[PDB]
Design an enzyme around this catalytic site. Structure first.
Site, PDB file in Angstrom:
ATOM      1  N   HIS A  45      -0.359   2.283  -5.202  1.00 20.83           N
ATOM      2  CA  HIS A  45      -0.414   3.611  -4.454  1.00 20.83           C
ATOM      3  C   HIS A  45       0.212   3.451  -3.030  1.00 20.83           C
ATOM      4  CE1 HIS A  45      -4.415   2.149  -2.953  1.00 20.83           C
ATOM      5  NE2 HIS A  45      -4.031   2.783  -1.833  1.00 20.83           N
ATOM      6  N   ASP A  89      -3.350  -0.278 -10.610  1.00 20.15           N
ATOM      7  CA  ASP A  89      -2.988  -0.039  -9.200  1.00 20.15           C
ATOM      8  C   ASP A  89      -2.527  -1.353  -8.624  1.00 20.15           C
ATOM      9  OD1 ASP A  89      -2.450   1.098  -6.744  1.00 20.15           O
ATOM     10  OD2 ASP A  89      -4.634   1.229  -6.156  1.00 20.15           O
ATOM     11  N   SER A 176      -5.892  -0.456   1.921  1.00 21.87           N
ATOM     12  CA  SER A 176      -5.334  -0.485   0.572  1.00 21.87           C
ATOM     13  C   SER A 176      -4.415  -1.690   0.390  1.00 21.87           C
ATOM     14  CB  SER A 176      -4.318   0.706   0.450  1.00 21.87           C
ATOM     15  OG  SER A 176      -4.863   1.913   0.489  1.00 21.87           O
TER      16      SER A 176
END
Ligand SMILES: CCO/N=C1/CN(C(=O)N[C@H](CC)c2ccc(C(=O)O)cc2)C(=O)[C@H](Cc2cc(Cl)ccc2OC)CN1
Ligand SMILES: *[C@@H]1O[C@H](CO)[C@@H](O)[C@H](O)[C@H]1NC(C)=O
Ligand SMILES: *[C@@H]1O[C@H](CO)[C@@H](O)[C@H](O)[C@H]1NC(C)=O
Ligand SMILES: [Zn+2]
Length: 220
Positions: A45, A89, A176
């Site tokens: 992402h 992811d 992230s």
């Protein structure tokens, strides 16, 4: 990182700070980590039109001789990455050159519930606070998969359930892609969680993706 403390400068020399360019908005940021002198692991992402990676940083606003700012030539986003289910992811970034090995820059070469692991990042330190200037870290408990049930697409084979719901410690926005280290090995990557940061959160389980990782690294 919420509820953590400032890392000893340069004590996590594999940490990568990613600036993500997109064509229709201002820059965004993620973490990542150096697995080879020319490969950074991060979250799918975090993909964008182009990315620049800063290695050797602690205080991201104060340039120093430890800094290596490197261009990413290609992004290898997992081909099954799914924006509905949020599975898979994970992404490799190939760097234009090989990073130099210094006291500040090195690689991090290659699990059940109960264990305490550590995550690090330059992300927000609170729900409504800005991203941190300095690298922060926190210790988080690995949980039984049941603790993550309320994430309907959570899958224990692909993902780790991380953070004791009784504590406020968590990764947040800007963190992230950063690694979850358990006994000095990377076991996961920050993926997602609640908008209010109430733990637990969902991390990509790196062991399931090792064949895929090896295939990209051997062909490049
Ligand atoms: C599988 C898809 O997951 N999507 C997201 C959303 N997300 C972002 O989209 N981040 C972008 C960078 C790609 C971003 C946006 C805003 C900001 C900011 O500082 O405002 C920083 C980074 C994120 O940054 C999330 C951060 C986060 C981590 C956890 Cl562990 C828990 C909650 C949470 O956010 C509410 C992680 N995941
Ligand atoms: C980071 O570096 C800047 C510029 O030197 C300084 O103003 C700021 O206080 C530093 N932040 C810290 C140590 O938290
Ligand atoms: C995402 O996963 C769902 C359920 O697995 C599937 O129906 C969908 O086709 C996948 N692909 C995309 C492009 O979202
Ligand atoms: Zn320094």
């Amino acid at each position: 990182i919420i509820g953590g403390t400032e890392s000893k400068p340069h004590s996590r020399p594999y940490m990568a700070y990613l600036e993500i360019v997109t064509s229709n908005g201002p820059s965004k940021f993620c973490g990542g980590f150096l697995i080879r002198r020319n490969f950074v692991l991060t979250a799918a992402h975090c993909a964008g039109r182009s990315i620049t990676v800063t290695l050797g940083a602690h205080n991201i606003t104060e340039e120093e001789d430890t800094w290596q700012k490197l261009e990413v030539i290609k992004q290898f986003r997992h081909p099954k990455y799914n924006t509905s289910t949020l599975h898979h992811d994970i992404m490799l970034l190939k760097l234009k050159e090989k990073a130099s090995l210094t006291l500040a820059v090195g690689t991090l070469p290659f699990v059940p519930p109960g264990r305490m692991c550590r995550v690090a990042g330059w992300g927000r330190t609170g729900v409504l606070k800005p991203g941190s200037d300095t690298l922060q870290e926190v210790k988080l408990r690995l949980m039984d998969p049941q603790a993550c049930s309320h994430f309907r697409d959570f899958d224990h084979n692909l993902q780790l359930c991380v953070g004791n719901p009784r504590k406020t410690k968590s990764a947040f926005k800007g963190d992230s892609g950063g690694p979850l280290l358990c006994a000095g090995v990377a076991q996961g990557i920050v993926s997602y969680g609640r908008s209010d940061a109430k733990p637990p959160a969902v991390f990509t389980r790196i062991s399931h993706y090792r064949p895929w990782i090896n295939q990209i690294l051997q062909a490049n």
